[PDB]
Every structure is written in structure tokens, then in C-alpha cells.
Nucleic acid binder design. Structure first.
Lengths: 271, 46
RNA sequence: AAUUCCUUGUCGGGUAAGUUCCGACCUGCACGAAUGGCGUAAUGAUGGCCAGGCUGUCUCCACCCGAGACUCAGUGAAAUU
RNA sequence: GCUCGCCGGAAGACCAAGGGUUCCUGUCCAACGUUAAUCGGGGCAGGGUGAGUCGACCCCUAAGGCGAGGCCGAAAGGCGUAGUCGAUGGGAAACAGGUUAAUAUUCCUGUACUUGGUGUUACUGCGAAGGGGGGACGGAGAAGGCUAUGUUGGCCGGGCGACGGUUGUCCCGGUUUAAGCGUGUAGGCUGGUUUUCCAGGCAAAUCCGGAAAAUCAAGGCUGAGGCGUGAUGACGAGGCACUACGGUGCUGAAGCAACAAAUGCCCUGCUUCCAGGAAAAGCCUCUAAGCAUCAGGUAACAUCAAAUCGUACCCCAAACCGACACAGGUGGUCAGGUAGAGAAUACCAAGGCGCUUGAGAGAACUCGGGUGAAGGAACUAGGCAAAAUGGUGCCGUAACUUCGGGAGAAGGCACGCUGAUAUGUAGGUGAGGUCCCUCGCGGAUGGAGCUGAAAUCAGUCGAAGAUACCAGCUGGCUGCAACUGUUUAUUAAAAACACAGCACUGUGCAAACACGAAAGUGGACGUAUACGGUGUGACGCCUGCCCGGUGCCGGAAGGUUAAUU
RNA sequence: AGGACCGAACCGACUAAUGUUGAAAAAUUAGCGGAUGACUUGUGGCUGGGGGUGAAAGGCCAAUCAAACCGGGAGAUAGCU
């Protein structure tokens, strides 16, 4: 649930936590762990390509099964685990054959619940089926953009997708952003919603909390010299020019989508 | 007061050593220039 | 007013006496609502002002203890011209 | 040589980095040393650095580097796969004593330990570039059990006092002993064993994982310290002959107990929290292709091997970085006594030093300090500076407030020593004895001895008892920023920047965006509760009117309009 | 529990004096701030000049920064001294 910390000191006055006792209070499944070195926002050239990235707590990557290609083998959820690499929670599921895997935790999935994959699996949360077998109008998550390449949509804390229509080979989807995107009616999807809805209610409460996540401070640009940002300096606070990126793009309505490759799966954009 | 030079043999060798210069063409030209000038010590080897 | 040129605006408080400070008035030279407006407990090697204590800060400097200054021996510069 | 002073969480001791003979001995004093110099980190000559166990090398890998082919690029070259490098991390083993003018865990004495080669004997399923296990990991907190170490007593040796007393409840010194081996305790973790079955672990598997039964409750693993042995030894305060008054043979007593106690050890533990806390090999198992009266594997014994390089000396400094024998800078380890909460502070031990110009004088003035009549901010841009406050316990404590604060608000009282309560109490520690027992490093009981606050009462000394060092000035009004933080290294620490929060906007993933002629990489092994950009800046109450201008987002009728034809 | 409180090590640099041919091309002395964290530090690595990095001062990038340093074009040009 959501708990508000008492104001024992500044920096705890506005801290709001999201404590979930159901999560595992122990080490994760070691075989499904990999090294995850921080980049600092620097590419192979050593240059900062993305700003405001650096530091933070050391993290270990968890191998989450986004394909769910084990069909016909029932699995039982062992425990819910905290994943530092994502906003959502992962669940350790044990298959009947003795294999263990990590999957995104849906809304109402708890220890002891049974899940299955494949066309013959039932319509219950946590089960993965191709859209062809999903009844229209149902809510799904971990949607596959292309068949067999692994889920890519609605994998955040409390996101999901709505199937609005199935036009034969293609099935229309309502991405939570607003797009009425359509994908081939062979892409696997998982029933239910990714369950961490309370995640958005979290309030960091202090500067140091952001630094733990690896987010470095952001410098506006108006409080900068002209040689550094287009907004530049001035005697006092002037900002007598249109808002713009550090490299000279509007950022106040100027659409930047220039893909043009697909232009076929986008029924409606947003809003 | 901490000064600019903080000696370190390992860092010195991998920054201006003979093998470091030979690793790139520009470093090789540095050796060629020093050889033409007749330098008694080409690099900071020892 | 971190904004008011005229200006030490005017009235009140504090002082024997207050161009600063505090509280009001509004005639806002030239405040104003996310280049945010107005409040705000706590916080500050932050700006302004007033008290108690405290004192050589001062009226007004006196004496004393040390290191230099001064003399002797040794060593022995500098700017400038 | 005798006094004096100084450091003693170092100004002592041992290292890394760095330096490279500054180390030790003899000799010399021109230059170097801010003076003299017989002296020196100076000149000259000689000597000095002994390792299977310490470090490097080596095996393994992180960030990252290079990179066969490959992809990309006018050339140069860029990126990157297989690989190969790369410690600041993981991986076998030595302790004590003695010894040199200068080295030692390296030599010597004593006592051990580790990994391999080969051989013999016995018993045998061995085999990896593969599978599994293990290695293997955070912050904070809480104790308990110990040790280093300390104190006191006992014990042994010596002493009987330059001046009153000092044969006693007196004074001084010592009271030390390792690795290894055996025991496996305080304590921590986990239910054992056997059989059958299986869509998993790229193939296989007796291993790992999963499933289903039966049978037992005691199995296993980990683990400081203690004890035994090592040790009839070594060391040992002091003696006895040699004794160049420079030092060595021989001998060498006691060598125990109690209490206190770590920031070290048990502990890579336990508890708890969110920000969720390396990799690989060695090691342990599993089998595949293969080899099977072989080869290999396990165990015992024997034998051999463990190379090469570093090892001097300084290392908070005169030897390193600062042009200097320079008030500077420089990582790790060791951590005694009295008082103390303490690694603060004061005085000291071990140990090391008095800082490489001195001698006089006792003017002005400058510098660093001490005290001050009466007044007490009249000083000054400004209480700048100085003075003052300063500890523990108890009492008490306002407006305001986000109910946490404000607050140590403000203010007041008591503090020494001696005796008694109590010839040392409450408490802590815990012997002997007795009882029990799976007779053990056990449990119960027992209270000797040791250690030891705090409080009350009474008495007593001084001007002053938190007497030294150490150690908050306090309160009222108000601007700005919420706050902790950050910033112009070297005149600006702020009201500036960050900030949590809020809003707008872009972005459907081969995301936007950014670095790149490109390949590619970051964003992200993320997916709209996500990410980028912009503005605002906790929180509370709120954020009004204007779309003509500029920008942005839509629009289709018309006008105008490039290459091309 | 805490970007909690007091306070050494440690990291900082608010005030004053001294020093200013200094002991020191930014330090000393007495006070001062943080001191479990957005902390601090060792070793190694990465980002290269119209570029880097920057809790943003035009700061820092080897005592040099509104475009580093070294060599070259180069005996640039100088209606100026």
C-alpha cells in the first residue's frame, strides 16, 4: 500500500512510499541473473549522448521471459520479487517440468496461482495467447509487436492494451498512450494488467532519492551562457526567444516523428 | 598544495611508453622525428 | 517593495535626537499571477534593525611578558640607476 | 656523560606509491649545508639486499584496451565477433627464538606446512572447449560470546633510604612463550535417509531441478576463543670468570590468578530497510564423443622438484610532488598509562627530538599575548576585533507550527574533600562445595574472592569545587531562498545553480534524441505509471483577460511557385 | 528510522590578523561549515580543442582558457611606436 512518512526531518516530510509485503524478502534466483554495468549516458565513443544519467545503486539484471513460448506446460507462481531494472514486479514461476523463469507480475497474480501459454490455454490473467484466440475487447499486456520476437508493449507498472477490433489477419489495439495501432493477429499477448498501479503514487521527497535512481541534476538552460544553450544568458532573467532544445528544435508542439516506414499500423495518433 | 605532477610508473609507461607510441601511426611518426633529431632517449621507457 | 525618480513621501512606533529599521496609508515615475502572485513552520558561516550580557572598540591610553627592530661576530640579497 | 625542554592518534613504529644507494664502515672538508664544522642525506673508497611459504611472475576475470575474419569509410582509418590483454578484486603453503657495523617470516636453531613430477603396492569407471553446485558479494542497526590489551593481587629477585618517618597495608623490576597438530565449545544455517517416475539444464547424465511414496527423528555443514600438545625447550630480571671497559661463554629464580576490556574476532552471521546490493577461474560433482585383461582415478609409502625477479634505505619526509635541507601536499597498518563520553584535551610510557647562525642590549615602532581605575559601543560604514557564554543532573520553558518542531527556548538550583549508611552498598563477575548427567569445553545449586557506581545524611577547607586544558552568548522584528546540498582552484558561497513537487510538449520502439561522412553505440537489454526537451521550483490558498503580432499545430478551395518537359 | 542533532579523524574555506622581493606563484594563526551521505578517499580506465566536461561561474581541461599546448604556413599583416 501507500504510506506517508512522518515529518521527523526535512527530506522525509514529503516522502511517500509504496510498501508491498507480498514481495520476496530474500535474494533472487541466481541462475537468472546477469551483470548489468552502468553506462553513465556515454556511448562507445565516450561522449555523453543522453544527459542526466550517472551514479545510482548497483543493479543486477534479471532474465525476464518476454516471449512465453513454453506452450502446454502449466506453471505455478513461486513468489513475487522486486526488480530494480523496471517499475513493475516480476514473478518466479515453476513449470511442471522443473524449469524456472521470470515473468512480469499481472494485476491480481499471487503465489500458488497457475498460468499457461499456448493457443489452448484458458482466458485468465497471466496466460499468454496469440491475439487470434483473445476475445475482442479484453485487456492484455506484454503485447508482441511482431510474432515471436517477445513482448514490447504495455510492460510498465500499470499499463495495458485494449483490443478494439480484429480485421482478419490484423488486430487493432488501443495503446494506453492513445494510438489505435494494429498488429498482426499472431503476436502473443498476456491477459490482465501489469500490477504495480500504486507505483505512480510514489513521491521521492528529496533530491538524494532521485540520485539513487541514477538521475543526475538537470540544468535549465535559461540559467546558462549563450555559448552553451540557445536560451543563453542576459542581465537578469530575459528569455526573449521561443523555447528550443540545446541543439535548436522547438519542443513546444513541433512533432518529431519522421519515420514514414510503417505509416500503415497507425490508425490514430493520440488525443 | 597538490601539484600537477603525481608520478606513476604504470601510467607513465602506458601513456608515453615505447609500445604505446608504436601502437598508432602518429606515435610511430613521433619516434621517427626523434630518431631523425638523434635523441639519446626515444621515450620514457626507463 | 531586492521594484518609488521626485523622496529623508506622510502618519505612528522605537531613540534626548532614527536618510536605516518596524507598522500603516496608496499619488504603483516604472508590482502582478508557473521568465509564477501572495503567505509560510523549520533551516541559513545569507541582508537589515533593536535589546540584555560583555568588554581597551572608544573617552584615553598605561604597564608588563615574548619575537623583531638596535649593538657585536659569521654568511650575505633585491627592486632601481 | 649529567641535567633541562618538546612530541607522544606522533614530531613514535611498519609499508604501498615515488625516489634509486640517500643504507653500513673507513677516510677527506675545497665546493654543497643560508654561520663554524673535526660533523652530514657532501667528496672518495670498500662493504651491504641470501625465500617452495612475503611480493611480483603465474591461473582468473571487472571497467576498459587491442582485435583473425567481418561491417563501414576518399586515403589515413572507425566499430566490433571469435579471441587475447587488462587489478584497484578471486586463487596452494612458516611460525617462534637467536644472529650482522649494515639483510632476514629470506641466514642459523627448533618445530611445521602446501602444490606438482616420478616410482611401488592395493583398490578401481576414467574421460570436456559441455551441464550443475560452489566461489558470490548492499546499507543500517542490535546485542551476546571472546581475544588483543590493561589494572590489581599473588609469586620471585633486589632494596631499607643524601633531610623528619620508612621491616611494612612499604619501594623498584620481572612474572614472556608462536605457527602447527588434537579436541570441535559460545553460537549460526539446514529436517535426514531409501526407492520409483519426469515436456527442464542446447546432446547425454547416477549430478541439478521437478513429482509421488515409505521410513526415522537425530543428520550434516559452519564456527571465534578456551584447553592439551608443541615446550625436560626457548626466553627470562639479575649473577659468575673472561672483560681492548668494545662485549661474549656458562648459570639464570618466579613465569600464576582475578577483574576490566575493544573500533579487532565469532560475523561473508543475526535483525531490519529499499535505493535491491561484480565477473571468471581454482575447488566439488555430472556425464558426451572416446579408452577398457589398457589408459586413467582413489589411498598409502618412497623419492624428486618448487624456477625467475623484488628484498638495502627514506616513505606525513631534508631521500616522494612543490626550482630550496621549502611552516604546503601525500594512501594503508599498529593504537600503552592517569583524568575523560572519546582516536577531543592535559600530563606521561615505549620511542624520537630541541626544528643548521649565535652573543648582547632591554629605545621608538611593528608583530603574538597578559592585566586594568571610572565609564560601558560614546568606536565604527557595521559590536570588525576583543571580551563574554561554555559541562553533567534535576526543575522549568513563550509566540508560532506543516504537530515533527520551536527547545539545549529563556531561567533557576546542586557540584570539592572526609566519614557513615555499607569496616565497598545496588549492580556486574564468579571459585570451592553439593546435586544431576546422553560422565562433557555439561546443567542446576552455591556463594568465597575480585570489581564497583549512584544517592542520602553529617562534618570540613578555600575568595572561588563543571576550579587547569577542554567547553553553546541569548532574546525581539523583518527581506530573500523552502530545506540537506552545489558554485567562479587563486579578491564574489549569495537572494545565484541543484532540489523534491508541478505543468506543457515530443516520443509506438529499428522510439524521439544524441555521438558518428558510415558501420554502429548510447537512450535501454528500457516500452507511455517509460524516455527526451523546456519552464516553474517544498507545502498552503491560487494562477485572471488577450490568438492582432511571432512560433507551433491543423485545413483544403483559390492565387503564386523549382528542377523537369 | 533520518540528504536528523552535538562533535574529532576526514573533506571543506565564512571572518579577522599576519604575510605581500612571503616559510608558501593563495599559505600560517585564532575562530568557522559538513561530518551515514547529492559523503569522502586509493588504484586503474574513458571523454580532446570550436571539442570535452560542467548541481552553470564562461567554471575547469597539467601554476596557461570568451576557444589548451607543441610544431608548421611564417620573416602572417601592422597607413602604428
Amino acid at each position: 500500500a501507500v504510506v506517508k512518512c512522518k515529518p521527523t526531518s526535512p527530506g522525509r516530510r514529503h516522502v511517500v512510499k509504496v510498501v508491498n509485503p507480498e514481495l520476496h524478502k530474500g535474494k533472487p534466483f541466481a541462475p537468472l541473473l546477469e551483470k548489468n554495468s552502468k553506462s553513465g549516458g556515454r556511448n562507445n565513443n565516450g561522449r555523453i549522448t543522453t544527459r542526466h544519467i550517472g551514479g545510482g545503486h548497483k543493479q543486477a539484471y534479471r532474465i525476464v521471459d518476454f516471449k512465453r513460448n513454453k506452450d502446454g506446460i502449466p506453471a505455478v507462481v513461486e513468489r513475487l520479487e522486486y526488480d530494480p531494472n523496471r517499475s513493475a514486479n516480476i514473478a518466479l514461476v515453476l513449470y511442471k517440468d522443473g524449469e524456472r523463469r521470470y515473468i512480469l507480475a499481472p494485476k491480481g497474480l499471487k503465489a500458488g496461482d497457475q498460468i499457461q501459454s499456448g493457443v489452448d490455454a484458458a482466458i485468465k490473467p497471466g496466460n499468454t495467447l496469440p491475439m487470434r484466440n483473445i476475445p475482442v475487447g479484453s485487456t492484455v499486456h506484454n503485447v508482441e509487436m511482431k510474432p515471436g520476437k517477445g513482448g514490447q508493449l504495455a510492460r510498465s507498472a500499470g499499463t495495458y492494451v485494449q483490443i478494439v477490433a480484429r480485421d482478419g489477419a490484423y488486430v487493432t489495439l488501443r495503446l494506453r498512450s492513445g494510438e489505435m495501432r494494429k498488429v498482426e493477429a499472431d503476436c502473443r499477448a498476456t491477459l490482465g494488467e501489469v500490477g504495480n498501479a500504486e507505483h505512480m503514487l510514489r513521491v521521492l521527497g528529496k533530491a538524494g532519492a532521485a540520485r539513487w535512481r541514477g538521475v543526475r541534476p538537470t540544468v535549465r538552460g535559461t540559467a546558462m551562457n549563450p555559448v552553451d544553450h540557445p536560451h543563453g544568458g542576459g542581465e537578469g532573467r530575459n528569455f526573449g526567444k521561443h523555447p528550443v532544445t540545446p541543439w535548436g528544435v522547438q519542443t513546444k508542439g513541433k512533432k518529431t516523428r519522421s519515420n514514414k516506414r510503417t505509416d500503415k499500423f497507425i490508425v490514430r495518433r493520440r488525443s | 598544495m597538490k601539484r600537477t605532477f603525481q608520478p606513476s610508473v604504470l601510467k607513465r609507461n602506458r601513456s608515453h611508453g615505447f609500445r604505446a607510441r608504436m601502437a598508432t601511426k602518429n606515435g610511430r611518426q613521433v619516434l621517427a622525428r626523434r630518431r631523425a633529431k638523434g635523441r639519446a632517449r626515444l621515450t620514457v621507457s626507463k
